[PDB]
Design a protein around this ligand. Structure first.
Ligand SMILES: Nc1ncnc2c1ncn2[C@@H]1C[C@H](O)[C@@H](COP(=O)(O)OP(=O)(O)C(F)(F)P(=O)(O)O)O1
Ligand SMILES: [Mg+2]
Ligand code: NA
Ligand code: NA
Ligand code: NA
Length: 327
DNA sequence: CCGACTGCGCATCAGC
DNA sequence: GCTGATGCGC
DNA sequence: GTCGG
């Protein structure tokens, strides 16, 4: 877990993972490559051979021999050739625009659209989300200093309580994990009249207020229980404007807060793993509930969290505080 | 050999 | 008009 | 791609 220990290898595997997701559209190879990259990143030795790497869970014959080629040459012919391929590297680049996934990137590249400038020249072919991701392309790849996160949280908390005192608003994600920077802002939201009962307008009013005071600036998606959009800190004197930022709001049944906060905290690789073996344990976890598997695939009446969680005791693992949840 | 693989709300697309 | 499937990014 | 039925 020392980073320069096997960074070349895990770099290589992460680049392979991205090519599989964005170009081959092979999501399970993508996950396989990332699981291998992850397990190797936590391995406390410098790998000397593919055979050594193959001992780790999630490393197999194919990654083993990619490793031997990489150790033997410091390169991978397949990646070498892929990077040089105009179609493939354009498809992969385009997926960095929010809203453009592997399918859209492919469709765009097939009709001659390969760069940010081609997209701008072709805004008719873009949907609402895609135009916004293009508009804020740079900003959306910028990190948010924790200091700004705190200002953002002040505004969110302040404006939420205005709408209705009984709302609860939690800022989750890496911020809740104490990170000194974040890629976006995730707001977990609950209201006492949302558990089992419902009025289905609680989220709309939160959103509307945040737009009113010019905090939220764009909408990407907006439904009953989930908002995805764009927001922005106000600026000062002649102050340089802050970057536009991605913000999501999830409205959970108050019934199910703890499962909500575990999941939106998370981290994404951490939920994959926490859920992946929870399957081993005879359980399945989502943002709503933890449930057992009784027969050979069961639901199970999910009765209510009583205390903190010990979701973790149910699947028999020690509590990793949000700080230790990057993995 | 061959299927599972973490889990899901909303926008859009496919179709009746 | 509608239902159901898929893409997308969580 | 990897793991396991
Ligand atoms: N496929 C998934 N499965 C489970 N949880 C997920 C998944 N994808 C995303 N989540 C997440 C778990 C995740 O914690 C939460 C928010 O997603 P985020 O904002 O993309 O991830 P973080 O905020 O942690 C970040 F570190 F990447 P940031 O600081 O750069 O924004 O839903
Ligand atoms: Mg985030
Ligand atoms: Na292995
Ligand atoms: Na994208
Ligand atoms: Na997010």
């Amino acid at each position: 877990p020392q980073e320069t220990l096997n960074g070349g290898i895990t770099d290589m595997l992460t680049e392979l993972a991205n090519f599989e997701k964005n170009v081959s559209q092979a999501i399970h190879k993508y996950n396989a490559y990332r699981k291998a990259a992850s397990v190797i990143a936590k391995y406390p030795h410098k790998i000397k051979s593919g055979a050594e790497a193959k001992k780790l869970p999630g490393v197999g014959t194919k990654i083993a021999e990619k490793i031997d080629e990489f150790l033997a040459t410091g390169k991978l012919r397949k990646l070498e050739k892929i990077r040089q391929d105009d179609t493939s590297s354009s498809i992969n680049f385009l997926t960095r625009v929010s809203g453009i996934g592997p399918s859209a990137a492919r469709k765009f590249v097939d009709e001659g659209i390969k760069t940010l400038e081609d997209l701008r020249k072709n805004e008719d072919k873009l949907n609402h989300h895609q135009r916004i991701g293009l508009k804020y392309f740079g900003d959306f790849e910028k990190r948010i200093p924790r200091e700004e996160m705190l200002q953002m949280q002040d505004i969110v908390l302040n404006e939420v309580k205005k709408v209705d005192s009984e709302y609860i608003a939690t800022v989750c994600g890496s911020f809740r994990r104490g990170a000194e920077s974040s890629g976006d802002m995730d707001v977990l939201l609950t209201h006492p009249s949302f558990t089992s009962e419902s009025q289905p307008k609680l989220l709309h009013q939160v959103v509307e207020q945040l737009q009113k005071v010019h905090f939220i600036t764009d909408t990407l998606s907006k439904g009953e229980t989930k908002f995805m959009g764009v927001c922005q800190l106000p600026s000062k004197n002649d102050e340089k404007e802050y970057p536009h930022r991605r913000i999501d709001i999830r409205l959970i049944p108050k019934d199910q807060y703890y499962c909500g906060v575990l999941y939106f905290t998370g981290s994404d690789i951490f939920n994959k793993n926490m859920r992946a073996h929870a399957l081993e344990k005879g359980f399945t976890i989502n943002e709503y509930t933890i449930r057992p598997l009784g027969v050979t695939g069961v639901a199970g009446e999910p009765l209510p969290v009583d205390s903190e969680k010990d979701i973790f005791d149910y699947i028999q693992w020690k509590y990793r505080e949000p700080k230790d949840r990057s993995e």
